[PDB]
Ligand binder design. Structure first.
Ligand SMILES: [Zn+2]
Lengths: 43, 48, 56, 155, 195, 326, 162, 54
């Protein structure tokens, strides 16, 4: 009779808190660009 | 390109509703004709 | 070692023009108002012999 | 039932011909040869079947100027049939009046492509029935429990 | 080639679209078992990859029921028959597989004392079948949405394979959007059981 | 040779001669606002009504010497009638035992077997019998439909074309394959090409519409005032709006006001715009300016002439002209 | 050996002898959960949601009861039989009076989950409802010793039947 | 009165056949056909105890 003792963030938990969304946003930043000024700010 | 588990995957602890006897018609539709579960004898599953 | 894993999405996740029919006889909740149906009390339907004969 | 049936069956008394050019014998059985079959059932379940008691000449059959023996009153003989466009909506009914499977009608509505502006009316009067077969299906269950196909069937 | 040593599976270009695991679909190249494939090259659902077929092949449409539909395999289709294969390989792998367990069950209700988590199904998917998924897709049944799986014997639970609409994938799998992964909880003493 | 009348469909009624004595006997002795006890129905011949089991019995179950009614029947049915015309009598017995009966034209099933010359048992539905029975043509049903008028006070309450689809369906349900439909070819004529036959229908079939509509619109101008009221169409609402619009009636109110056709009382910008500000919060219709709603939120049951009439009310000098006078 | 030279998959026949193959008790064990769904082509079919061993006499008594509750000219029941059969009391001291002949003769099927059993298939444009369907099968289901639920035409969507 | 083995088998055969709470057991009682169409859910006797019927 879980989810009574533990929360809903139990059994209904996709413990894969690693990469359901970030990987996508990773390929987002891949798309836009990086250039001189994008390094000059880092400069 | 996003799939959200939450839209289609529904894990709801649903209350198994009683067949409403207090009203006559909804008692007859609800009569899911599998009440012949009486064939649940734990019979010999690998012999006869 | 081979590991099988889903491909990346290029279109809508839940199929729409590819959906298999629901699989249970689609007698809707409104053709036999079995349960789960909520109606305003002003807009009560189909009492043609009880209380729609004298509508309001 | 026996009662409510005609005992005396008057015969088609052709009043006046609908043509001046006699339909020569050769073509008569050339067009009637096409009528001995009539479709039935309107879907994939189309069934071209046979028709018993085929009339012999259909240039004269009903298109005009024949009588129909529904003689009812004292002074009203077997009424003559006026020409086609003299009856209202006939070539419009030809589009509407027929066995309509709802399978074949709802694709016409959701595509709003009605051959006729009354098939929207033969649709409602067809669904408004099937709902009634339910609102009677259920206003009975409020009496008792009626269970379909639960009694023996056949012999 | 010898009568003793025969290729355990052979390359195949499908012309038709077979449902089964060994099946494929229109125009993809697949190494399916020899015995199965050999009753395809006779059946016509498949043809060995001659250099000609490697560009186009006359696949099949159930519409007119004959080999008319020309499916040309340019580099673009070869990016379509990959994602469409890589997809229905996860399908036919979890649907064919029957993932086992060993658990402890003191007590009478035949109740697994530490019931299962959707973590503990993706864990036995990646363990046994190497099927790597998101445990957010696994929807449990109604009996086991509350307490987890919790009971010995055969349990099953639904895995949602979301991204199948641009692959045009239906009628070649049993359910476009789900699959029944089929547990089984073989109770074991502290010797071989965990948790 | 001689076409009796060349008009695009002016034969929708019986001859005023036969239509004179049509309702002399098919009349409803008005309901006395009593409580009916029995609504009996019989088949009885022209005037051969007896005191036997068919009639005299059900009276005698109630102690009425039906030897009288048969005479009062024959006081109205013995003349006027071709021999052997089985009529239907709708006897209605009130709590005072005083009956009131309407004589009615023969059942259309009786008509149908006459007009095809088939006896009892020869006709049948194909799924029970396997064969279409005697043919017919729509030209014939239009005259079975002329002696079958539900309101024998108002001879055409159902317009005649509407009445025919009824008798046609009852025919098909008996196996009566009529020619105009059910077959590959209509009735062949020695007059002209099939095209010169179809090109003469495409004009007739549409001339009837302006004939049929006008008769459908003249009917609505004398229809109950409630009938010409506004009832918005529900085909646009999708079945989640159609359900989320049933839990709270407020949406089906603001809708009505939002899409009411213009009138002298609904030319209030704020009243119309008050609704239009309610729906937008509900995410309902948002890209449809008022016009394209009225043309879709109209009472579809209006005769085209009348929907067109209500749709252009703002053009009709505005309804700001027509008001409750005084 | 073991299964080969089948007698068209009803039962396997010894290769070097026409005798029946006399398999093990838990051969073809139904205690799987069948992955492959059934693509029924009747209007409704009676699938077995559970597993068990069902005789032919229990399946024939069910047909004789389904064939009573069904409109005759419209629907024709369709009973599948391609499935494999299995033996009974076979062994020699394990038979009664050394009559191994009269005990093995019974042939029972080992049904897994979701095998279709019958079919209310159509012979016309006549239609059925789930209420009109379960009412038919409610007679036979009381004989078929394992749990079964009726399914509508086409691919059983086993998300719902379970 | 035939104990309809589960509660769910209960069906109202007649117009006068209704449900009743005969001591915690949902039953069907009809004035007409008094015992002919009567059905009673399966449950412990109205006066049971903890050692006799568990
Ligand atoms: Zn009763």
């Amino acid at each position: 009779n879980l989810n009574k003792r533990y929360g809903a963030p139990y059994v209904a938990k996709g413990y894969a808190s690693l990469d359901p969304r970030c990987s996508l946003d990773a390929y987002s930043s891949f798309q836009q660009t990086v250039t001189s000024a994008d390094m000059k700010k880092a400069l | 390109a996003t799939y959200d588990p939450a839209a289609f995957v529904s894990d709801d602890i649903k209350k198994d509703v009683r067949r409403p006897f207090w009203s006559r018609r909804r008692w007859a539709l609800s009569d899911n004709f599998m009440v012949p579960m009486s064939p649940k004898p734990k019979n010999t599953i690998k012999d006869e | 070692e081979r590991y099988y894993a889903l491909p990346h999405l290029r279109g809508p996740s839940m199929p729409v023009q590819l959906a298999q029919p629901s699989g249970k006889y689609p007698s809707g909740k409104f053709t036999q108002m079995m349960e789960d149906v909520a109606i305003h009390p002003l807009q009560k339907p189909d009492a043609r012999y009880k209380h729609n004969m004298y509508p309001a | 039932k026996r009662s409510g049936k005609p005992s005396d069956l008057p015969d088609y008394k052709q009043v006046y011909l609908p043509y001046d050019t006699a339909p020569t014998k050769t073509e008569l059985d050339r067009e009637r040869r096409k009528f001995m079959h009539a479709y039935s059932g309107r879907m994939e379940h189309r069934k071209m079947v046979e028709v018993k008691d085929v009339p012999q000449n259909m240039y004269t059959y009903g298109k005009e100027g024949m009588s129909i023996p529904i003689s009812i009153f004292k002074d009203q003989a077997d009424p003559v049939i006026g020409p086609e466009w003299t009856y209202p909506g006939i070539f419009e009914n030809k589009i509407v009046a027929q066995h309509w499977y709802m399978e074949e009608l709802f694709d016409r509505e959701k595509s709003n492509t009605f051959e006729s502006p009354w098939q929207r009316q033969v649709l409602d009067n067809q669904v408004k029935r099937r709902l009634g077969k339910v609102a009677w299906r259920m206003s009975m269950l409020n009496i008792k429990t009626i269970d379909i196909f639960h009694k023996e069937r056949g012999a | 080639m010898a009568p003793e040593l025969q290729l355990e599976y052979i390359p195949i270009i499908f012309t038709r679209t077979i449902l089964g695991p060994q099946g494929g679909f229109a125009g993809e190249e697949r190494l399916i078992k020899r015995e199965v494939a050999q009753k395809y090259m006779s059946e016509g659902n498949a043809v060995t990859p001659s250099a000609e077929f490697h560009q186009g092949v006359w696949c099949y449409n159930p519409d007119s029921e004959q080999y008319d539909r020309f499916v040309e395999r340019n580099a673009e289709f070869l990016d379509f028959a990959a994602r469409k294969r890589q997809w229905l390989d996860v399908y036919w792998r979890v649907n064919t597989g029957y993932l086992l367990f060993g658990r402890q069950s003191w007590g009478q209700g035949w109740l697994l004392n530490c019931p299962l988590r959707k973590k503990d199904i993706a864990q036995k998917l990646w363990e046994q079948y190497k099927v790597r998924v998101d445990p957010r897709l696994i929807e449990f049944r109604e009996k086991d949405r509350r307490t987890g799986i919790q009971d010995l014997g055969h349990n099953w639970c639904w895995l949602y394979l979301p991204g199948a609409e641009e692959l045009a994938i239906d009628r070649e799998v049993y359910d476009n959007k789900r699959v029944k992964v089929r547990m089984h909880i073989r109770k074991m003493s502290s010797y071989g059981a965990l948790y | 040779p001689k076409t009796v009348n060349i008009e695009p469909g002016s034969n929708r009624f019986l001859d005023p001669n036969v239509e004179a004595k049509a309702k002399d006997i098919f009349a409803v002795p008005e309901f006395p606002n009593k409580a009916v006890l029995h609504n009996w129905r019989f088949f009885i011949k022209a005037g051969k009504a007896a005191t036997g089991p068919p009639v005299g019995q059900e009276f005698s179950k109630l102690g009425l010497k039906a030897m009288d009614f048969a005479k009062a029947f024959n006081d109205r049915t013995k003349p006027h009638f071709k021999d052997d015309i089985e009529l239907i009598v709708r006897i209605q017995v009130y709590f005072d035992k005083s009956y009131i009966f309407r004589i009615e034209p023969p059942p259309t099933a009786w008509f149908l077997l006459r007009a095809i010359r088939k006896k009892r048992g020869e006709t049948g539905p194909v799924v029970l019998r396997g064969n279409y029975c005697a043919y017919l043509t729509l030209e014939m049903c239009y005259e079975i439909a002329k002696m079958k008028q539900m309101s024998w006070g108002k001879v055409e309450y159902p317009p005649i074309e509407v009445r025919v689809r009824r008798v046609v369906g009852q025919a098909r349900r008996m196996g009566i394959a009529i020619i105009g439909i059910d077959t590959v070819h209509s009735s062949p004529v020695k007059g002209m090409t099939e095209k010169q036959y179809l090109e003469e229908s495409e004009k007739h079939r549409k001339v009837h519409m302006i004939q049929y509509e006008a008769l459908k619109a003249k009917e609505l101008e004398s229809a109950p005032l409630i009938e010409r009221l506004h009832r918005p169409n529900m085909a646009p609402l999708t079945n989640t709006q159609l359900e989320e619009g049933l839990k709270d009636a407020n949406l089906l109110n603001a809708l009505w006001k939002s899409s009411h056709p213009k009138s002298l009382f609904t030319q209030d910008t704020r009243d119309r715009e008050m609704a239009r500000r309610y729906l937008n919060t509900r995410g309902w219709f948002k890209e449809m300016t008022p016009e394209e709603m009225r043309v879709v939120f109209l009472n579809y049951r209006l005769p085209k002439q009348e929907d067109h009439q209500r749709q252009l009310n703002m053009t009709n000098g505005q309804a700001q002209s027509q008001a409750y006078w005084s | 050996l073991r299964p080969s030279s089948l007698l068209r998959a009803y039962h396997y026949v010894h290769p070097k002898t026409g005798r029946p193959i006399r398999q093990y008790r838990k051969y073809g064990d139904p205690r799987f959960i069948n992955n492959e769904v059934a693509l029924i082509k009747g209007l409704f079919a009676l699938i077995t949601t559970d597993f068990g061993m069902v005789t032919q006499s229990q399946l024939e008594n069910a047909r004789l009861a389904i064939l009573r509750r069904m409109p005759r000219g419209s629907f024709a029941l369709t009973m599948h039989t391609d499935y494999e059969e299995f033996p009974v009391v076979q062994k020699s001291p394990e038979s009664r009076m050394g009559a191994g002949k009269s005990n093995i003769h019974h042939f029972a099927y080992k049904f897994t989950t979701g095998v279709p059993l019958f079919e209310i298939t159509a012979l016309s444009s006549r239609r059925l409802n789930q209420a009109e369907a379960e009412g038919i099968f409610l007679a036979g289901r009381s004989f078929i010793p394992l749990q079964t639920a009726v399914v509508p035409r086409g691919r059983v969507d086993e998300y719902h039947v379970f | 009165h035939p104990g309809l083995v589960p509660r769910d088998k209960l069906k109202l055969h007649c117009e006068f056949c209704r449900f009743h709470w005969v001591q915690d057991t949902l039953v069907v009682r009809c004035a007409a056909h008094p015992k002919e169409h009567n059905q009673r859910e399966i449950w412990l006797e109205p006066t049971w105890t903890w050692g006799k019927q568990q």
